[PDB]
């Protein structure tokens, strides 16, 4: 098949032609390797200038895991609104598990180039060397493009911001909290431009989970070692509420764990009566059985609107 050229992908002003890209990428159509490198590195250079902790005003549509499922990413934008007039925040895990990981990366990076101030991308735990080597992304890059393209993606992933402060009310992360993250400044002071370490605050942001019995803890341990992930922690409901109160926040919005309906709202804060934690998951998943359903979160006009799709 035809490999798209730079003139076919970019207009004379340097704007990516994302409708052309969308139609070609869903057929697993490839770009010229130099053009893919241009998309990845231009997007990376934009991400690199962003803060560890993004400042994102409402209105915004918040999205969880994609995992290379390009057809569901296309549906998500239909449900959530066109990026041409909709602000977006993605919470990571763009690659692995699904079949179209490099296509999702190239399309989202193109959208970031086109809408640098209204479409935002965070890092998930899969956006790293260790996991893309263990799953399929590293092999797919080498096959369809080259190791140079894989290396460029790894460097670009290093540039992904770690978190977002949304409407000065919500902390948004892929995974969750850390025993070493007690204030928002704790996130701001991190060096994110690296492979995520095996332990520590950057690891925990990307990897941690609420306890299985979140909201009905038998003990008082805020963070316990995470036996599902084999790294990082489970965080408790008192752990979350204490973080929220200390930092004058309403809730934590995160992704990272698939849910039956595409979302879950956990136990409400005893102070505000608002769910202390919300998980959003924005593409299908294969855990026990296949589950096509997914959801996005649209925060607008002081209404938290959870929109399910893919029924």
């Amino acid at each position: 098949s035809h490999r798209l050229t730079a003139k076919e992908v970019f207009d004379n002003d340097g704007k990516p032609r994302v409708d052309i890209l969308k139609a070609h990428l869903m057929k697993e159509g490839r770009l010229e390797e130099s053009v893919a490198l241009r998309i990845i590195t231009e997007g990376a250079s934009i991400l690199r200038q962003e803060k560890n902790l993004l400042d994102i005003d409402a209105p915004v549509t918040v999205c969880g895991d994609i995992h290379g499922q390009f057809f569901d990413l296309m549906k998500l934008f239909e449900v959530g609104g066109s990026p041409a007039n909709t602000r977006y925040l993605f919470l990571g895990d763009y690659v692995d598990r699904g079949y179209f990981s490099i296509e999702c990366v190239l399309y989202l990076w193109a959208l970031k180039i086109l809408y640098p101030k209204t479409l935002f991308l965070l890092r998930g735990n899969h956006e790293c060397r260790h996991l893309t080597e263990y799953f399929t992304f590293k092999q797919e890059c080498k096959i369809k493009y080259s190791e140079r393209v894989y290396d460029a993606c790894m460097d670009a992933f290093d540039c992904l911001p770690l978190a977002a402060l949304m409407n000065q009310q919500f902390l948004c992360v892929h995974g969750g909290l850390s025993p070493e993250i007690n204030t928002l400044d704790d996130i701001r002071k991190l060096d994110r431009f690296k492979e995520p370490p095996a332990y520590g605050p950057m690891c925990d942001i990307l990897w941690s989970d609420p306890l299985e019995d979140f909201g009905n803890e038998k003990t008082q341990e805020h963070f316990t070692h995470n036996t599902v992930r084999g790294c990082s922690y489970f965080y408790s409901y008192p752990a979350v509420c204490e973080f929220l109160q200390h930092n004058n926040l309403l809730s934590i919005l995160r992704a990272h764990e698939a849910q039956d309906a595409g979302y879950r709202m956990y136990r409400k804060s005893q102070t505000t009566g608002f769910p202390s934690l919300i998980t959003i998951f924005s593409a299908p998943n294969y855990l026990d059985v296949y589950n096509n359903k997914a959801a996005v979160l649209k925060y607008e006009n002081n209404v938290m609107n959870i929109r399910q799709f893919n029924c």
């Binding site: 709202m265 938290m304 959870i306 399910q308 799709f309 029924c311």
Partner: peptide, 9 residues
């Protein structure tokens, strides 16, 4: 405090 609206399909 915002309200929550769930839209299911």
């Amino acid at each position: 405090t915002p309200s929550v609206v769930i839209t299911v399909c």
